């Protein structure tokens, strides 16, 4: 067995989502009243949702608009997450983590989504059957790009960061996995691309999620 864990981004790495988060945002703004420059909505993709709206909106994160904005995005986004069902996921996601799992790695969530909200995607999609444990951005104190989430999931694990990796498709998750002493695999399919996340720090940037279970299971 491995005995080495794996800490895995959700959003643009497991779940194809960043054109959806996109689109929803913008239905959050428009239902608020208002909308933002494209550019502006792309540059949040995929980052802590309350901080990304507030910015967005041009308020304080504690104003009460941000909370209004982050329910009516917590509706959407779960109808969205009940229409795709699996169909979330990238091909060979599950496939891919069942034989991470069978070589031995044992298998976290690191998302900058709230807890209940990763929980709930896991148990839509199926993701929840194979992790072991799932962190979210309320889930500590500092989320990314502080290492915090990445030890706690360790720990839970009970896998050192010396044997741990990242897998992420943004700077953040990049990041977090330095500065939490692990390795790094980027991945190039979601937010970011290839030259950003090595300046990041990625060890690796591969292109696709089957890339990147064979990047672990090789060594
Ligand atoms: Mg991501």
Same mark, same amino acid.
């Given at each position: 067995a491995a005995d080495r864990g794996v800490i895995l981004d959700l959003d643009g790495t497991l779940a194809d989502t960043p054109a959806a988060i996109a689109?929803?945002?913008a239905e959050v703004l428009a239902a608020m009243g208002t909308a933002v420059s494209r550019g502006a909505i792309l540059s949040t993709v995929g980052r802590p949702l309350p901080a990304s709206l507030a910015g967005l909106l041009g308020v304080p994160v504690e104003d009460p608009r941000v909370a209004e904005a982050t329910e009516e995005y917590g509706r959407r986004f779960g109808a969205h997450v009940r229409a795709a069902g699996p169909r979330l996921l990238?091909? +060979?996601?599950?496939?891919?983590?069942d034989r991470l799992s069978a070589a031995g790695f044992r298998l976290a969530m690191a998302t900058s989504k709230v807890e209940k909200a990763a929980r709930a995607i896991a148990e839509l999609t199926g993701?929840? &059957? *194979?992790? &072991?444990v799932i962190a979210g951005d309320d889930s500590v104190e500092r989320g990314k790009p502080h290492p915090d989430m990445a030890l706690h $999931?360790?720990?839970?694990?009970?896998?050192?960061? %010396?044997?741990?990796?990242?897998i992420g498709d943004g $700077?953040?998750?990049? %990041?977090? +996995? *330095?500065?939490?002493?692990? &390795?790094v695999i980027g991945? #190039?399919? +979601?937010? #970011?691309?290839?030259? %950003?996340?090595?300046?990041?720090?990625?060890?690796?940037?591969?292109? #696709?999620?089957?890339?990147?279970?064979?990047?672990?299971?090789? +060594?």
């Open positions: 689109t929803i945002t990238y091909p +060979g996601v599950l496939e891919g983590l993701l929840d &059957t *194979r992790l &072991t $999931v360790a720990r839970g694990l009970g896998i050192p960061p %010396e044997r741990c990796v990242v $700077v953040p998750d990049a %990041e977090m +996995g *330095r500065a939490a002493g692990m &390795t991945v #190039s399919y +979601g937010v #970011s691309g290839p030259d %950003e996340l090595m300046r990041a720090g990625a060890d690796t940037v591969v292109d #696709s999620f089957p890339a990147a279970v064979t990047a672990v299971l090789d +060594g």
